[model samples]
Target: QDNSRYTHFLTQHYDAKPQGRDDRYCESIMRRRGLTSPCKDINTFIHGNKRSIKAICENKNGNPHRENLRISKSSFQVTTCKLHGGSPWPPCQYRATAGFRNVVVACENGLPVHLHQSIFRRP
Candidate 1:
């Protein structure tokens, strides 16, 4: 449940539709999005639609309550943030990454999707 929220926040804040082709895309947005300093190790951006993304949570079997998953296609953009060139407050840098990789995008909406960490009992 917790991880889902974090991923949702990241998706909304740090991710984008690959709008601008700055090449330095991550370098620009990470700071803009406030992933400053040493920056996030790796940030994921989905090229999928929001409505469709939300639908993933609607799957039958997997959910926060139950133990499981219901997941994606589409090209995803990945940003590897780091600190390289700087002159002051923790700098930011990144390398380009693009590929079709399977990702676990926890859309922490009202339901607060869960990625199933080890546990026992339930409600």
Candidate 2:
């Protein structure tokens, strides 16, 4: 259970803007994944959309919030795919891949802190 044992593969930063349309995009993703409940109104859904994104990324049980998921914000987007084998740089094609999940988190100004896989792993 040493979650710190996990490592960060990459981190990319982007500018994010929170607006009405972007909020709808987030909500749509959640709904498609069945992450949003019928009881949850659109307003409530928008409010915690970012938090839901983070939760799904952290959950490695294959029950992802969305399938083949890619999240985008008004500003930036981040992706984390599990590193099974090979070095973490230069993008290897022969490396064994497992739990290769990708989640996108919305950033308010720049990139979202949780989206940085390095932030989740211990130095």
Candidate 3:
């Protein structure tokens, strides 16, 4: 039951096989994961190795906000997908924006279960 939370996080967020195809990437992943019923309003995909992201749950990185929520000490590559026209129908379209920022993830038993949010520093 709870295991899927982490699985969902990985599938929904963290993209291991990254193509950086802004236009097609979001729709492609959404379809593969069966998340196109009404189309997800918004989603952020973190790029890079899974191990570094997982390390945030190791208790070494300082915890921020709540006990389960951990913020990364460093920034990582991320792509945000925003649904176009607020989900008109099937085959949802998304506009992707790229950024580098520190991320926050909700963890359980030393494992990250969800991506809570991200922090962007002022440039």
Best by lDDT: 3
What lDDT does each candidate get? 0.47, 0.30, 0.74
Per-prediction TM-score: 0.55, 0.19, 0.82
> Model 2 residue 49 lDDT?
35
Candidate 3 on 11-68: residue-level lDDT in tens?
7887876666586888787667776787877778888878778778765653575665
- Model 3's number of clashes is 0
Error of 1 at 95 (Å): 0.6
- Which runs in model 1 stand beyond 4 Å of their true positions? 1-16, 21-23, 60-70, 73-89, 107-123
Sort the predicted structures by TM-score, highest score first.
3, 1, 2
lDDT of 2: 0.30
Q: Lowest summed lDDT over 10 consecutive residues: which window, candidate 3?
A: 114-123
- In candidate 3, how many Å is residue 12 off? 0.9
Query: Candidate 3: where are CA atoms >4 Å away?
Result: 66-68, 117-123
Off by over 4 Å in 2: 1-21, 38-123
